[PDB]
């Protein structure tokens, strides 16, 4: 898995389940092209977004729909979504884990990058 | 001062000085129009971005140029920038503090919303 | 003011008000002796803990009673309290800001060390 | 595994490897008794600290030696260690993951608690 997303809920101390995630890649004409999408599983993870062959050098954006997650729990949150933007694979193929920790008025995001 | 930004450096335990910040407002055509910008001061803060008159309800994006900050320190960072997207809502008098805590592979952002 | 504490609530996007803080200094017998204490103000800050005269080099512990704070809101929390342990070192003039960002199952703490 | 610890490095974007961890349990006489210890693996994880039979109700402290980790990388950090203190199993047996994200002047810690 070259790209995996993991989302945790800091209010409940649990994985964040059924969170929508959209990934985009910056195209030649400086616009964001849809690349992949999915929802987190019961473990708060999203696997299988892409393959090593498809995941070429580029600037990518991972957008996590945090607002819908909190609203479904009855909480009105601050952010519209969480976005993570990064250059990938520019010194060769790597594996990327993007982790997000969510609270209604705060989030953090961390990347773990490994060389296969 | 209804909107202020504070940026901290988690590697050095210091304010993040001279970081570029751009603020955008979402226009009816669903694109981002420039709204305000500046560089953080010696205390890592950016004040005087807008006034109560101009800061109407709407969707705002705050973009922090984190990549330039780490590159000046000689540290290779993960993210292209840090983006915070939120709705401003009239619901009594509101002041918004957007704080960001920066590491090379991780950031957190928190909103503090108070009423004078 | 060489030592100050700031506490934020990530669930409500507000200062964490009326939180008990205790400060201890490590004594030569390797036990913790009380040093200073207080409750955070309306802005979530605690000032006036000590003076430059008394704040000598040594190992200090700052204990934040997070559990009582969440229990007052009716939220069941994970941690018994939040503890920050550090060495104060004379190395030019130093002011220490210890910040904590609280969620029910997660906290972060950051030190900002500046020189007037 | 009733108790697992995972440690990440926010400066390098990698797991934090060979980090010493000590766990204690509060004894009848209000002192901290040693319970288990170990070091994180190449994946930044520490498994096998305890069993369900041994992991009874109590107040536990997980101490992570962050200072030694940073010093070995040539960085002088702020904190002496990171401590996580919590009541475990008081409403029946659960599984606990304690995660820590480390920077030299900041850390965060999150608990994920599941019902087996």
Numbering used by the authors:
A (entry chain A), B (entry chain B), C (entry chain B), D (entry chain A): 10 to 125
The article reads:
Human transthyretin (TTR) is a 55 kDa homotetramer that transports thyroxine and retinol-binding protein in the blood and cerebrospinal fluid. Wild-type TTR is inherently amyloidogenic and can lead to senile systemic amyloidosis (SSA). Native human TTR is known to be a homotetramer, or, more precisely, a dimer of dimers. The monomer consists of two four-stranded β-sheets, arranged in a sandwich-like tertiary structure in which β-strands HGAD are opposed to β-strands FEBC.
An X-ray dataset was subsequently collected to 1.95 Å resolution at room temperature from a crystal originating from the same crystallization well. The availability of both X-ray and neutron diffraction data allowed joint refinements, increasing the data-to-parameter ratio and reducing the influence of systematic errors. The primary dimer, formed by monomers A and B, constitutes the crystallographic asymmetric unit. Some structural differences between the two monomers are clear in solvent-exposed loops (BC, CD, FG); these are likely to be imposed by the crystal lattice and would not be relevant to physiological conditions. A comparison of several X-ray structures from the PDB shows considerable variation in the assigned water structure in the binding channel – ranging from zero to four water molecules situated between the central serine residues, and it is therefore hard to be sure of the significance of these observations.
